[PDB]
Amino acid sequence: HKIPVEADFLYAYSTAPGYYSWRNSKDGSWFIQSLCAMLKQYADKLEFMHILTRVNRKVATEFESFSFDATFHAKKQIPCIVSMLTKELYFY
């Protein structure tokens, strides 16, 4: 009959609500680095949500801020998947 007008959106945020999002001046932002990596090897074998989860582990485990300001040093980051989707999404 009808579907909600807000249905079928997926917002992939680089960071948790309320938090900074880190970007490395030479390699790019942590999030987009890992998103592009995780798509390169898994878009042919994995559903999107599972790729984003993989993106989440990469950002959470392999990145760690470095800064001469102790206020910004050794800081972490977790992206935030917001799925209002109704079906699985495969790029194949």
Binding site: Y13, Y19, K75
Partner: peptide, 14 residues
């Protein structure tokens, strides 16, 4: 919608 942006000024201390 893929969004690379701050959502605040909180820092995750890990």
């Amino acid at each position: 919608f893929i969004i690379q942006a701050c959502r605040g000024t909180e820092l995750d201390c890990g």
